[PDB]
Amino acid sequence: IIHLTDDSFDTDVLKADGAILVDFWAEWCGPCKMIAPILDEIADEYQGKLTVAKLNIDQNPGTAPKYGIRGIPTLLLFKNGEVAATKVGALSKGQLKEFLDANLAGSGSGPSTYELKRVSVHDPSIVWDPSSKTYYIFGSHRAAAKTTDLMSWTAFTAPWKTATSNNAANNVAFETPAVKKVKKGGVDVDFPAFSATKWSAKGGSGYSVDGNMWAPDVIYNKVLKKWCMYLSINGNAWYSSIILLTADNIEGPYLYQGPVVIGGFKNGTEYKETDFELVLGPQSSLPERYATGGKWGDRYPNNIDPCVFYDEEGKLWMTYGSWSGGIWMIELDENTGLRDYDVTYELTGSGNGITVDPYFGKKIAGGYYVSGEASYIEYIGGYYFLFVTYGGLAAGGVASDYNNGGYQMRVFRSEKPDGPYLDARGTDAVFASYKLDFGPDANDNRGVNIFGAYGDWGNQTKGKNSERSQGHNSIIAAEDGRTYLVYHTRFQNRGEEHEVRVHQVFQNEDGWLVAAPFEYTGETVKSADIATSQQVPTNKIAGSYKLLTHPFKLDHRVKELAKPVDIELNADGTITGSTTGTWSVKEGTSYITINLDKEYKGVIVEQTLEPTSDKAFVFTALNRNGVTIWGYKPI
Template identity: 40%
Template sequence: MTAPRTRLSHRLAAGMAATTLALTGCTAPSHSSGAIVDQVSDIKRVSVHDPSVVKANDTYYVFGSHRAWAKSTDLVNWETFSNNLSTDFKDILGDIWQAWPKQPANSDLTGNMWAPEVVWNETMGKWCMYMSVNGTNYKSVIVLLTADDIEGDWTYVGPVVYSGFRTDTMAATDVPQVLGSDTTPSRYLSPGDTEINAIDPCVTYDEDGTMWMTFGSWFGGLWMLKLDPATGLRDYSTTYNQVEDRSDPYYGVKIAGGHAVSGEGSYLLNTNGYWYLFVSYAALQQTGGYQVRLFRSKDITGPYLDEAGNSAIFTSSITENWLGGTGIRLMSSVQWSGNDSDAIEVAQGHNSAMVDDDGTAYIVYHTRFSSRGEEHEVRVRELLPTADGWLTAAPYEYTGVKAASAGYATSELSGDYELVVHKTATFFQGLQATAKSDGDNSGTQYKGVELPVSITLHANGTVSGERTGTWNVSEGSNQMTITLTSDDGETTYAGAFADLPRDKDLKQVMTFSAIGGNQSIWASKV
C-alpha cells in the first residue's frame, strides 16, 4: 500500500476490554437530512478502545487497545479486520514480554497490549506501529513494529522507551546507555516525581520534519522525545537536561501533568496555526469521570496552555485535578432533545484527531453510555476552528454532514435553542432514584449529566431566555461570538454555527459550539 495522503496520530490504554463488534461497513443511501445513513440504527458501529486514527489512500483506520482495529471509507460506518497481531501476538511480542513487563502478578500478555499508534515513515518506507506492552507497577515498554501494508502483517523491531526500572533491573533496558549510569536516580522511584507508565504513544512530525513521540500516564506526567526516522526508534543523538517540571535526561521534554495528578492519552494535532494537545483526565470507567481537556502552543514542545493561561504541566499535587479548571473540557454528558436518554455519552476520552484532505478536522474517541455499563464504541465529531484560534467539538456525532464554512442565512440562525455548558466538576454518576436540587440535575433520572437551559437568538443580535446577552456572526462565515450573562457574570464565547443531524433521529438542526471563559458550550435549535 502506498503512503497516506493524510497522516494523523493517536490515544490511551484500557483496563477492561469490551467485546469488539463484528460489523460490516457500507455506505447507505443519503438521508434527506444529508446524513450518510437513513436512520441512526443503520450506522455500522465498532468497539475500539483508545482509537488512534490514520488515513491511507481513501480509507480511515483506527487502531486500539487489546488488538482491536477497524476501518471505514466515510468515518461513519466501520468494519473490523484482523492481521497477524490479532492471533500470533504471543509469538511476535513474546520475547520482549518475557524480558520486561511479565511479572507473577501480571503474567498474561493477552490483556496488556495498549493504545497503539500507527504512522507512515517516509524514510523507512514502512508503516510504523508504536504499542504499549504493559506491566504491573509501571513496568512497561513502548515497542515498534513495522509493516509494508497498513493492514499488516506486522514485524517486531524493538523497544523505544521503558518505565518501572530499578537499579537491579536497569541492565535489561537502554536506561544505562542514555543516563551513563548503572544506578537508578531517586526521581524515577516516585510517582509523585518522575515515575511514569510508558504507555499511550502519539507520534507526529513537526514543521521541520523532526519525528516526535509523546507518551506517559498519570502521576509522573506526560513527556515527549525525538525519534530517529531512519530506524523509527529513539534518537540517541539528542540529549535532554534535567530541569524540574520541564525536561529529563531519559524521558525528554515534559508537556503535561506530573505531581501525581491524573492525565493520559496525550495527542498532538497541528492545524489552525497551533499545536493542540489533547489529554484525558480521570478514570476510564463509566462513572470514572473520563474527559478530554485541550491546550495549545505555537511550539511542538510547548508550553501548552489553556484559554486562561494555565499550563498543562502541574508543579504541585492537586487532588482530583479532573474536577478543576485546568484545560478546556471539550465535551461532557448531555441530556437534551437532540439525543436518546438511554444512550447519553459518558466517560468520553482517549481521543485521536485528524485534519482530512479537504481541511476538515475531526476528533475520534471512545465513549461509554448511560445505560450500557462498560461497553464502549467509537465516535467521531467535527472540530470547528474559532476566530481566536481554538478548536471546539461539534454538538452532534459526525454522520456525513459538515459545517458550512461559508456561513448560513440569519433566518436560519435566529430562533430558540437549548444551551449546555460543559462544566469541569460535573461527571456521570449513574441513576438517581430521587431528583435533587443544588446542582444535582433536578428533573433527570441521571446524576452528573448536563441539562440545557432555553435561550433565543434574535435577528437583532440580542439573546433572551434563561441566559441573556448578545450574539453576532461574521459575514460570509460560520464564525460567531456570543456574550452571555449568568450568576457568574458576563462571558464572551467564540465558536461556529453548524447545521447538523441530531444524534437521536438525524433531524437536521442548527447548532453552535463555542469556547469562552475557559469552558466549552453547545447549543441546539429546537
C-alpha cells in the first residue's frame, strides 16, 4: 500500500498507469480503522490489476476538497487520473470485491446484471403484446419464445384449434377454412374450401406438412381484436400458400381462417381450386402467362415468408416471396385480415418482365430467380425500410456448393409502403435480369449490407462462436422508443446450430439504418436521442479502436469471416494505424463521420460487451456503396 501525501498525489495518482484505489481517512474515525485491514488484504489479492493508496486527510488538507470528499473513509477509484467510481464507508471485504469486480475490466460475466438465455427459433418474427408488456417471436416449425427484456427468452408452443379440438394435429389444422364467404363489390361471394396441405401435396409424392410450416408473421388486427398468424405452408414445384390463422390470445390456440395467397397453379384447371377467380373473375382457361411449366420461378413467386404490417395511414399490406420471381406485395382487408378482393392490379410488363400481375400483385424486389427471401418492412424515422435476406440459410463451408450458406441481410428504403425500394445509391431492389447477387462470384451488389459474417469481435463473437449466415430478420420500432433488429444466426464451428440475436438500430444523419455492433444488453439510449444529444463527449473519443468492415462478396464456401484491424483515432481528427483517414463529429448530436478510402456516416454510442459488464464507445457507419463499418474502444 502506497501511503501518499498531497504533493505526491499528482504523480502517484493522476500520473498512474493502471487503476488506483484511494482511501481518504483520518485519525478520529472508527470506520477508517475497521477498513484498514480489509484494504491490506485487497492489496494482496488484487496485485495484478490495481494499486491501493491512502491519504491521511489530517496531514493533507489539500487533496480531498477537490474531489468533494465528505464522509470518511471515502474510497476513490482513479482511472489514469480521473474518478471512475466512488464509495463511502467501512465496506466489508465482500462489498469491496463486488465493487472492484464491477469497475475493473477483465472480470468476466460474474458482475454483469443481465442474463442472455438463448433460444433457437428459426426465422424469428417479433411482436409486442401490450396486455402483458411482453415481446414474442414466432418462427418456423412452430417454434415460439417470449421475453420481457430481449435478453432472456423462454420457448413455448402455441396450440392449433379446429372445430372439434383445442390442441389439433398439424395434419388436420389447415384443411377447412373457418371463413365461407368474403366481400367483393361489397356483396358476399363464396370463398374456396381450400385445404393448404392437399394443395402443397400436389408438388410431390408422400407429402407431410410437419417440416413445411415456415416463417409465420404474427400481428394484432385492430378491427377484429384478434392476434393473426400468417403462416407459409410450403410444397415443392411452387405449390405453396400463405394462410391466416387467428386467436383471442397471442399464445393460441390459433384457428385456420383461410388462404391469403396461393401459388403454383401452372397446370390445367387447378386454378379452380384456388381464389384465382375471386381475384380475376370467372376464367374459362388458365391465362397463358401462368402456363410456365418448370420455368415458373423466372416469373412468379414461391408463396412463402409473409410480412404483414399496417402502413402509416392504417392500411394493411402483405409482402411475400422467396427467390424465384421475387418479392411481391398485395393489399389486405383491414376488417378480415384476408386479401382485399376489391383491389385491382393492372398487368404491367410481359413474360419474365412482368412487374405487376393481376393475381400476385406488385413486385417490390428480386425477379429472374435471383436470391432474396424473408422480406420485411417497418416504418422507422420517416421512411419505410425493406429488408431482404440474400444467399443460402446453411452455415456454409462446402467448397463445391455455392448455395450452401451465404445468408446476409440487405436493406432498402422508400417514402411509400409499396415502393419503389431503393438502396443508398438509388438502385432498385427489383432486378431487370438474372444476376448472381451474393457471395464471392457476385456480379451485383445492391442494398445496404447491414452486417455480414464476422469474428474476433468483442467477448462473444469469437472462435467457434463467430457469427455467420445471419438473416431472416424482423425489426420493430418499439413502444419504448428503441428499434430492435431480431434475426437468427449460425456460427463458425457449431454445425448447423442457430440462435436468436437482437441488436439495437439507429439512423445516421442521412436517415439510413446503422446496427449497434453488439447485442442489446439494456442500454438506455433511445432512437430520438441520436439527433438531439451527444452520447459520447468529443474529448473522450480519441484512442485505440478495433475497426471491422463488412464487405460484399465474402466466400461462405470456405466460411470466410470479416475480422477487425487496429486503428487509432487521434484527438486532432486523424486516423492512423492499419489505415489512414480522418474522423469528425457533429457537436450536440451523436453523429460521426469516418473518412477512410471513402466517407462513412454513422453514430457513436456506449455499448456493453456481452456477456461481461465491460463498456465501450462504439461507432457504426455506412457508405452509399452499401458497405458498413463498426469500431470499438474499451472505455
